[PDB]
Design a protein around this ligand. Structure first.
Ligand code: HEM
Length: 146
């Protein structure tokens, strides 16, 4: 797993404090597409601003949830044949709550953004590329899906 090690190596850094990094991801996501903000509704209430979501334990718990899943996807980076059916299932939950396949690009770009900011110089071209491949493989899975 030559291209896998890069993923585990890069991830171990962000895996240490999942909320902080997952916070950066969604801050970024909401900064790029604020139209995704109302998809996260808790207590029958809509977040007015992106920062409102940051004060929601429900929403923070969601971030952890997402961070845990990617970290799982990182565990299985070598085969990718184990997580397949969970992803189609996860993608199934996403279609259900009314997310669009076209937002995947935005989440991926937010994920890559978060990784770049965290790693700095360590976020090598090879590392960027492997993550793009990796994220691509999840989206395809989650898209099988719709
Ligand atoms: C394509 C853009 C995406 C959008 C707009 C989106 C939006 C959402 C929303 C609105 C929820 C509902 C959570 C809640 O109701 O509290 C959710 C759940 C979730 N998301 Fe995302 N999502 C996207 C892609 C992804 C990707 C690529 C992953 C990880 C590979 C992911 C991981 C998760 C997980 C693990 C959950 C909760 C699963 C569950 O509750 O069963 N999402 N997403």
């Amino acid at each position: 797993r030559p291209e896998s090690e890069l993923i585990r190596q890069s991830w171990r850094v962000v895996s240490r404090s999942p909320l902080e990094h997952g916070t950066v991801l969604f801050a970024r996501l909401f900064a790029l597409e604020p139209s995704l903000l109302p998809l996260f509704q808790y207590n029958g209430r809509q977040f007015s601003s992106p920062e409102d979501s940051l004060s929601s334990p429900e929403f923070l718990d969601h971030i952890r949830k997402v961070m845990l899943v990617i970290d799982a996807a990182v565990t299985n980076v070598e085969d990718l044949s184990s997580l397949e059916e969970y992803l189609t299932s996860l993608g199934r939950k996403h279609r259900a709550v009314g997310v669009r396949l076209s937002s995947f690009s935005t989440v991926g770009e937010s994920l890559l953004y978060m990784l770049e900011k965290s790693l700095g110089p360590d976020f090598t071209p090879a590392t960027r590329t492997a993550w793009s491949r990796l994220y691509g493989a999840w989206v395809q899975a989650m898209s099988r899906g719709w």
